[PDB]
Paper text:
When activated, CaM binds to and stimulates the activities of a family of Ca2+/CaM-dependent serine/threonine protein kinases (CaMKs), thereby regulating their functions. However, the regulation mechanism of [name] remains elusive. Here we report four crystal structures of three truncation variants of human [name]α, namely CaMKI320 (residues 1–320), CaMKI315 (residues 1–315), and CaMKI293 (residues 1–293), which correspond to the aforementioned three truncation forms of [name], respectively. The catalytic core of [name] takes a canonical bilobate architecture, with the N-terminal lobe (N lobe) consisting of five antiparallel β-strands and a prominent helix named helix αC and the C-terminal lobe (C lobe) comprised primarily of α-helices.
CaMKI293 lacks the autoinhibitory segment and exhibits a constitutive activity comparable to that of the full-length enzyme. Consistently, the CaMKI293-ATP structure resembles the Akt/PKB-GSK3β structure and displays the structural features of an active conformation. Specifically, helix αC assumes a position similar to that in the active Akt/PKB-GSK3β complex, and concomitantly Glu66 of helix αC adopts the same conformation as that of Glu200 of Akt/PKB and forms a salt bridge with Lys49. The bound ATP maintains similar interactions with the enzyme as in the CaMKI320-ATP and CaMKI315-ATP complexes but the phosphate groups of ATP also have a high average B factor, indicating a high flexibility that probably allows conformational changes to occur readily when the metal ion and/or the substrate bind to the catalytic site. In contrast, in the CaMKI293-ATP, the C-terminus (residues 278–293) is disordered, and consequently helix αD and the αD-αE loop show evident conformational changes. Concurrently, the space originally occupied by the C-terminal part of helix αR1 is vacant for substrate binding. The conformations of helix αD and the αD-αE loop particularly Tyr113 in CaMKI293-ATP are similar to those of the equivalents in Akt/PKB-GSK3β. In CaMKI293-ATP, with the rearrangement of helix αR1 and the consequent relaxation of helix αD, the constraint on Glu102 by Lys300 of helix αR2 is removed. The side chain of Glu102 displays a positional displacement of 1.5 Å towards the catalytic site and binds to the 3′-hydroxyl rather than both hydroxyls of the ribose of ATP. Lys49 of strand β3 moves upwards along with ATP by 2.5 Å and forms a salt bridge with Glu66 of helix αC.
Residue numbers in the entry: 9 to 52, 62 to 171, 180 to 193, 196 to 277
Write the structure that this text describes.
């Protein structure tokens, strides 16, 4: 049961478009009453997404402040982040140092652990879904887009876990985080091929390598960290707790 609005333009003052999605559009707006700036996700599974966001409150996760129904369109009023996505900053940098990447992955693990503890699994972690709070180089990262998250009971290739592809659980996110760590360290994905079917085979078989010379001087500890997240067997795969403990992070 969400609020109805005759027109959202009465409540919010729309400015620039911040971004677009397959089925959404994100606009910078001003709350007319409080004069604060917000990011409004406009949409023309979504109920799953909302239910999830209502359980969540973490400094490194984009908050849902409220929702309005107006003219067949949902308007998710959301915490504004202005730093753009991690994907872009990997491009405008090439790769991260071990120290910087480790700080970033910490903030990610901290947040996903908080979710796993709430029985929430994101299922779509990737650089494009990680948003910086600010333009400043020191800005914290924020987890966003819960459009595919699943709550416990009583996806982009490259980042999805082998078992997800063999068919259609918390281990899923831990794989993704390993792949994000791999990319931050070396600047390119662990799975890469021109043929989609071959690519799809690589991920299923979970065959990747810290290839020389790119990986030559990356620490054994970083590599051990990645192997333990990027582990084929979901049973043996590191949890967020085990990954937080690992010396590369701690
Ligand atoms: N809270 C926010 N603050 C600032 N910008 C945002 C915010 N949320 C999303 N954006 C921008 O808009 C884009 C919207 O994408 P989103 O996170 O919704 O995932 P998507 O797959 O692109 O869209 P969707 O999943 O809703 O179809 C983001 O990549 C980002 O650039």
């Amino acid at each position: 049961r969400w609020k109805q609005a005759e027109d959202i333009r009465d409540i919010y003052d729309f400015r620039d478009v911040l971004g677009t999605g397959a089925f959404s559009e994100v606009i910078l707006a001003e709350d007319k009453r409080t004069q604060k700036l917000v990011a409004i996700k406009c949409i023309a599974s979504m109920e799953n997404e909302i239910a999830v966001l209502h359980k969540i409150k973490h400094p490194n996760i984009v908050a849902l402040d409220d929702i309005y129904e107006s003219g067949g369109h949902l308007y998710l009023i959301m915490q504004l982040v202005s730093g753009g996505e991690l994907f872009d900053r990997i491009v405008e940098k090439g790769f991260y140092t071990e120290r910087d990447a480790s700080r970033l992955i910490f903030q990610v693990l901290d947040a996903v652990k908080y979710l796993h503890d709430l029985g929430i699994v994101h299922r779509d972690l990737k650089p494009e879904n990680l948003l910086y709070y600010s333009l400043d180089e020191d800005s914290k990262i924020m987890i966003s887009d819960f459009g595919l998250s699943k709550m416990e009971d009583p996806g982009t290739p490259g980042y999805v876990a082998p078992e997800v592809l063999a068919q259609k659980s918390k281990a899923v996110d831990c794989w993704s985080i390993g792949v994000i760590a791999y990319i931050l360290l070396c600047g390119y994905p662990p799975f890469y091929d021109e043929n989609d079917a071959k690519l799809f085979e690589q991920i299923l078989k979970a065959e990747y390598e810290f290839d020389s010379p790119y990986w030559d001087d990356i620490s054994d500890s970083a590599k051990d960290f990645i192997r333990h997240l990027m582990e084929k067997d979901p049973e043996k795969r590191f949890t967020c707790e085990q990954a937080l403990q690992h010396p590369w992070i701690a």
